[PDB]
Design a protein around this ligand. Structure first.
Ligand SMILES: [Zn+2]
Ligand SMILES: [Zn+2]
Lengths: 248, 114, 209, 285, 49, 240, 193
RNA sequence: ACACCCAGCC
């Protein structure tokens, strides 16, 4: 970690004077490999390379023993058929593997779009608006906007969606205090949405024929099919809610 | 400070006090010799950097080929315009990268710091 | 010192208030947020000798479900607590037939006082707390997750749901700082709620052994 | 981490640092001596005559039958100024530690030479040897201020956004607000947590046994998680969370800290054959 | 050739700066940084340069 | 370890007639907080050859035949006006107060040897022999090489004190000038010395067996030529 | 790879694996001394202005420099540099001192250690006197015609232009990397090679 | 068998 030590009597090599802390004395190779190293810096480079070789040939004998000990610590822990993780003595180590129930080979990196934005930006970009007739007519078809502006149940349902999203935002801010949105989750929703756009030749300019109440109902219905802790009693229901809280 | 031995058995003297006169006596703890102290010191300890390297360097260090030489720091006593400078490398400080200069003239060797 | 000692006493009393509240034991809302100035005004400012005597710091608290279940929180004056002191405090307890209580010790207690604490547990439960260990509310630390002592019926429901035996759950030592904070004996279960970065919340269970 | 205004104002943070750092009588004493002095009035040091004479005018239990063995300490200037103590604090600490048998004499903070005289009161080799013994003990094992284990506490602004305080503003935007933090070179976690003006929430330790014995089992689980992640992701490598979670849960499944060694794995309730395959084969069998 | 000249000039300036720091430390004119010894401060300065 | 600033001298006699013997004069670490342990300072001890536990250095010096401490410190300390080394060697004298003359020091040395035994004179002789033939053989093996050994031990303690005060740097095990290279010559000499000793032992046994039986012995038959030949061959063949 | 392996041990040749660093190879001009008897050195030193250990008061040791021969303290000397110059002259002239005898003056400690035993590793170096090589064109001309002549390496060693320096004496010398590039006249790095 | 070297790949 330090510079070349004073192996001789206050000298790195016999060729330097005593008490020389300059760059050449303590092992600063001012030459490139193309230009060639002078003898002193050649020796110092050899010292550095030898340090590298010693580390390579010594750290194996520590790391192999660390690895073997880690293996034999938990060679028997596995996911049993009630989705719990137990060791050879059937002592539950985790009630669900990784606390969510998901294998590590099918998860991707995703960004939570709710944790970072401020209250004004979050409300602007996540609260459905229906007072503005022009914008809603631009986004939606005539029949759909007529239905949205007519029914009051749909407006209440959309307000409930936004309220639930606000509570979810608060829960996220409790979970992630640092504020990083980079989480690991099973399904890539943005890439799947892009795949849906491309498969069906969705025009991003013309108004769409998707009823927002249909979006609400579809999301709610989907949330009941992603089951990690199946059951009916309150304990299983709470465990299921917790196991997929972040994904939901 | 100051160590000296009794003249009878040539062993280490030790401090002692008497109640009759209340005077320090450096008496030999082995034999039966006593003497009157003249410094009233027992144990002086030096915690911070009081090494005084200026009086510790051997003046013959100037004639070592491996030390640098400079002409910008002439000797104060003999006026020679060449000197040999070096650092300390002593424990108990591990700091103070200062230069100690020794004149290189023969029959000289005044040590000075700067 | 004078101001530092009363500040210490105030912090200890606030921590005891939070401890009792976390146990379901009825304390007034104002006591949970008693300021240093309020404590100084109500109890005293100079414990140098005699105005806030630690005997006056004794706290009575009751249980939410029933007034009958009460406790004491005590504060012996001397650094070292022994058989004769514990005997008189438990005699005072018996005069008011209370079961549970804590003893906040300044330095520690004798091996005899430790033995006398342990042996008579079934008759009256008594807990020890060094005053150093109560200057903070360890349950408020960011590392410590939310502990909740879960009742016998809930434990039975849990073991029925997961089809687990008693000893298959994860363990928590009886001498754990959090376990001592919550005052739990062997056989109880602690529902631990943690935030997770892959699920968002994770509820694990720990059995006291 | 600092809770109140000390997290921003620099000199309050320095006050906290001084209140935490261990400062024994070493590093602040120039040179000590055991000068003999049969009588107090005449003294033996010229520089310590007039203030000695005017201090000993009042017979406040320091003239009756004091031993003639003097201990001159000769405190330093620069080190005392850097550590920010004064004579009265040291005198109070000495009196508290050694009772009234070690009466302390000091001149002022205005003297160019910071002297300090200690004698032995009347109330078993000899007084000189005992005086030397207590001088060494007081130079080594006496605390002027701080915690007995903290060694070289530092201070710096956290440039990286991971360690600095992160908060939500009125509008909810995450603000990367910057505050002073301290990093020690010794663990006395429960003392440091209880100190005045110290955050008892975010104050953590890289040590694992201290977390277990102070905070709890879940606390040490979380701290072990964070420490393993810090080790792995220091070079930019990434490991999925669930593997670290499984390791941390396995070492903390049985209430206490379970080392990944013979002394932690072979002490579980596993079958003898697994243990004998691990290591210490014949002893297990 | 311009790149070689630039590299040589940079190395010459770096060596000159290191000699300047050595001269500053040799006259005890180098104020140590907080939390480090004078030797460690000098080593840190040389390494950074 | 419990020793701080140890010092050693792997002494070996010029002709290497004996294996190398190591003296390990060392200084105790400031770890003891007894009644008068840390106050005086640090004691200096010497782990002499063929003795199973440490000995304070002043006892060895006294055993070499220097009773008065003036003579001791005129060997360990060369400059009178140097209070630091005197203060640092105070504990060594303070520990050796109970030992006051040469013969009692010899008893101190001998009582901790290979065998405790019964009588006094035998282990006085043992201590004299181990200090005459096993402590620093390279400076003296003859009967009256005591002053030279005293000066060398004083130099060793002086080096220890200089290292403790920081006036010298502690040596490096790697400064390749501190390493010697045993080539084919010295290694073969090491085998040949022991194996010639074995041959002479065998000749002695054979000739004793013939002389006690009451007849002259033929020299040629006494020598077992197998020894040197199939010992050198074995060592160069197997490498052991 | 310690610093003192310069010129004695190859910085590159080591096995890779469990024996890295521990197994080394001699440099291409490394020479290991076979040892010599230290008797003539001792006789010369006694004949010179050196005073034995038993003939001196202990008070005189402090100012004088100690003399060690093969690690054995022999006596003391009051003029160190004169003795060092004389000893170096004798070694360079192939006198009673064998060419492989290492001779060391620790000036900062007032010690003179003369090593003669076997096992020391040393290499040849050119001798510099007042910033000039002692190896003149005459030596090169004689060496060029080694055939049909008797000039050889031993004649260089006997001529006092090349001497074997030990790895431990190497601490007390100033080596010039190359003669005509490190001994020229400029703002001199070192003027005492 | 066993032992000891050397060597290869990480
Ligand atoms: Zn005497
Ligand atoms: Zn001069």
């Amino acid at each position: 970690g330090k510079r070349i030590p004073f192996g001789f009597k206050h000298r790195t090599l016999p060729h330097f004077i005593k008490d020389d802390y300059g760059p050449e004395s303590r092992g600063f190779v001012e030459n490139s490999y193309l230009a060639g190293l002078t003898p002193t810096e050649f020796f110092f480079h050899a010292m550095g390379g030898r340090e590298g070789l010693i580390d390579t040939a010594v750290k194996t004998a520590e790391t192999g023993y660390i690895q073997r000990r880690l293996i034999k610590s938990m060679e028997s822990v596995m996911v049993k058929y009630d989705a719990t993780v137990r060791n050879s003595i059937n002592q539950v180590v985790q009630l669900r593997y990784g606390e969510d129930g998901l294998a590590g080979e099918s998860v991707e990196f995703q960004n939570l779009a709710t944790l970072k934005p401020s209250n004004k930006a979050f409300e602007k970009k996540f609260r459905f608006d229906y007072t503005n007739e022009r914008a809603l007519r631009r986004t939606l078809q005539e029949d759909l906007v007529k239905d949205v502006l007519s029914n009051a149940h749909i407006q209440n349902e959309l307000e409930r969606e936004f309220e639930r999203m606000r509570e979810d935002r608060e829960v996220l801010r409790v979970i992630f205090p640092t504020g990083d949105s980079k989480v690991v989750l099973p399904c890539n929703l943005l890439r799947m949405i892009w795949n849906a756009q491309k498969i069906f030749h969705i025009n991003p300019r013309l108004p769409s024929d998707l009823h927002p109440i249909k979006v609400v109902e579809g999301v709610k219905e989907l949330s009941k099919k992603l089951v990690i802790v199946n059951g009916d009693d309150p304990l299983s229901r709470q465990a299921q809610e917790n196991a997929t809280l972040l994904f939901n | 400070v100051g160590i000296r031995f009794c003249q009878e058995c040539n062993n280490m003297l030790y401090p002692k006090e008497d109640k009759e006169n209340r005077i320090l006596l450096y008496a030999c703890r082995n034999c039966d010799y006593q003497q009157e102290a003249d410094n009233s010191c027992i144990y002086v300890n030096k915690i911070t950097h009081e090494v005084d390297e200026l009086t510790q360097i051997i003046a013959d260090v100037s004639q070592d080929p491996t030390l640098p030489r400079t002409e910008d720091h002439p000797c104060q006593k003999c006026g020679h315009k060449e000197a040999v400078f070096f650092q300390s490398h002593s424990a108990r400080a591990e700091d103070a990268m200062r230069l100690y200069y020794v004149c290189t003239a023969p029959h000289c060797g005044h040590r000075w710091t700067e | 010192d004078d101001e530092e000692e009363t500040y210490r006493l105030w912090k200890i009393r606030k921590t005891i208030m939070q401890l009792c509240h976390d146990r379901g034991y009825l304390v007034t809302q104002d006591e949970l947020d008693q300021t240093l100035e309020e404590f100084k005004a109500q109890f005293g400012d100079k414990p140098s000798e005699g105005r806030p005597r630690r005997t006056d710091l004794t706290v009575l608290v009751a249980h939410n479900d029933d007034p009958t279940d009460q406790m004491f929180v005590f504060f012996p004056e001397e650094p070292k607590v022994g058989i004769k002191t514990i005997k008189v405090y438990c005699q005072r307890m018996q005069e008011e037939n209370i079961t549970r209580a804590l003893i906040v010790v300044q330095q520690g207690m004798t091996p005899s006082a430790k033995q006398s604490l342990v042996d008579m547990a079934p008759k009256y439960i008594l807990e020890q707390f060094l005053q150093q260990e109560l200057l903070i509310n360890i349950t408020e630390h960011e590392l410590v997750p939310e502990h909740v002592v879960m009742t016998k019926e809930e434990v039975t429901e849990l073991l029925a749901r997961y089809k687990l035996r008693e000893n298959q759950l994860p363990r928590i030592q009886a001498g754990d700082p959090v376990a001592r904070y919550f005052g739990i004996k062997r056989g109880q279960v602690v529902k631990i709620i943690r935030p997770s970065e892959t699920a968002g919340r994770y509820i694990t269970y720990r059995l006291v052994q | 981490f600092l809770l109140g205004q000390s997290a921003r104002d620099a000199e309050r943070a320095k006050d906290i640092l001084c209140r935490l750092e261990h400062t024994t009588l070493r590093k602040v004493t120039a040179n000590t001596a055991i000068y003999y002095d049969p009588n107090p009035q005449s003294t033996v040091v010229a520089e310590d005559q007039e203030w000695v004479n005017v201090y000993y005018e009042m017979p406040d239990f320091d003239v009756a039958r004091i031993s003639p063995w003097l201990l001159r300490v000769e405190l330093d200037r620069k080190h005392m100024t850097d550590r920010k103590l004064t004579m009265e604090q040291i005198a109070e600490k000495i009196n508290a530690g050694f009772g009234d048998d070690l009466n302390c004499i000091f001149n002022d903070d205005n003297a160019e030479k910071l002297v300090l005289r200690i004698r032995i009161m009347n109330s078993k080799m000899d007084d000189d040897v005992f005086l030397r013994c207590i001088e060494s003990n007081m130079l080594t094992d006496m605390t002027l201020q701080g915690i007995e284990q903290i060694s070289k506490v530092y201070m710096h602004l956290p440039q990286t956004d991971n360690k600095k305080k992160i908060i939500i503003t009125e509008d909810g935007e995450f603000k990367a607000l910057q505050e002073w933090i301290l990093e020690t070179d010794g663990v006395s976690l429960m003392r440091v947590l209880s100190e005045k003006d110290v955050d008892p929430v975010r104050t953590t330790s890289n040590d694992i046994v201290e977390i277990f014995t102070v905070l709890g089992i879940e606390a040490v689980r979380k701290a072990l998680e964070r420490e393993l992640y810090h080790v792995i992701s220091f070079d930019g490598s990434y490991v999925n969370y669930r593997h670290l979670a499984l390791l941390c849960d396995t070492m903390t499944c049985r209430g206490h800290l379970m080392a990944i060694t013979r002394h932690g794995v072979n002490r579980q309730d596993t079958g003898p054959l697994m243990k004998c395959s691990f290591e210490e084969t014949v002893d297990v069998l | 050739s311009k790149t070689y000249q630039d590299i040589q000039n940079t190395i010459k300036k770096a060596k000159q700066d290191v000699i300047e720091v050595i001269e500053k430390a040799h006259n005890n004119e180098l104020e140590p940084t907080p939390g480090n010894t004078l030797r460690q401060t000098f080593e840190n300065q040389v390494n950074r340069i | 370890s419990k020793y701080a600033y140890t010092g050693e001298c792997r002494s070996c006699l010029e002709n290497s007639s004996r294996p190398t013997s190591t003296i390990w004069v060392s200084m105790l670490a400031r770890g003891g907080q007894g009644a008068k342990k840390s106050a005086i300072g640090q004691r200096i001890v010497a782990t002499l050859p063929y003795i199973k536990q440490e000995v304070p250095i002043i006892i060895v010096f006294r055993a070499l035949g220097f009773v008065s401490d003036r003579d001791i410190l005129e060997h360990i300390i060369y400059d009178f006006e140097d209070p630091e080394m005197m203060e640092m060697v105070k504990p060594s004298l303070d520990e050796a107060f109970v030992i006051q003359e040469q013969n009692v020091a010899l008893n101190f040395i001998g009582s901790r040897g290979a065998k405790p035994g019964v009588t006094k004179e035998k282990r006085i002789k043992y201590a004299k022999e181990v200090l005459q033939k096993e402590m620093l053989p390279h400076v003296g093996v003859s009967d009256f090489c005591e002053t030279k050994k005293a000066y060398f031990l004083g130099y060793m303690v002086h080096r220890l004190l200089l290292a403790a005060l920081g006036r010298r740097e502690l040596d490096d095990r790697d400064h390749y000038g501190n390493k010697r290279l045993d080539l084919a010559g010295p290694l073969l000499a090491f085998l040949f010395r022991g194996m010639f000793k074995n041959l002479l032992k065998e000749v002695r046994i054979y000739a004793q067996k013939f002389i006690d039986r009451g007849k002259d012995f033929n020299l040629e038959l006494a020598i077992k030529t197998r020894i040197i030949s199939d010992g050198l061959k074995y060592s160069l063949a197997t490498g052991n | 790879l310690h610093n003192t392996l310069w010129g004695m041990v190859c910085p590159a040749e080591t096995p890779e694996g469990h024996a890295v660093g521990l197994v080394k190879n001699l440099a291409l001009m490394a020479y290991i001394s076979v040892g010599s008897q230290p008797s003539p050195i001792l006789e010369f030193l006694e004949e010179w202005s050196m005073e034995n250990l038993e003939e001196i008061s202990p008070a005189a040791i402090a100012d004088a420099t100690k003399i060690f021969v093969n690690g054995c303290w022999v006596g003391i000397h009051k003029d160190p540099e004169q003795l060092m110059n004389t000893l170096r002259k004798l070694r360079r002239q192939m006198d009673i001192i064998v060419s492989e005898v290492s001779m060391i003056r620790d000036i900062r400690e007032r010690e003179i250690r003369i090593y003669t035993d076997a096992g020391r590793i040393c290499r040849p170096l050119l001798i510099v006197e007042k910033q000039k090589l002692l190896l003149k064109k005459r030596h090169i001309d004689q060496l060029k015609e080694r055939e049909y002549n008797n000039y050889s390496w031993q004649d260089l060693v006997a001529s006092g232009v090349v001497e074997y320096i030990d790895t431990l004496e190497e601490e007390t010398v100033m080596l010039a990397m190359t003669p005509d590039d490190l001994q020229e006249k400029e703002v001199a790095y070192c003027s005492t090679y």
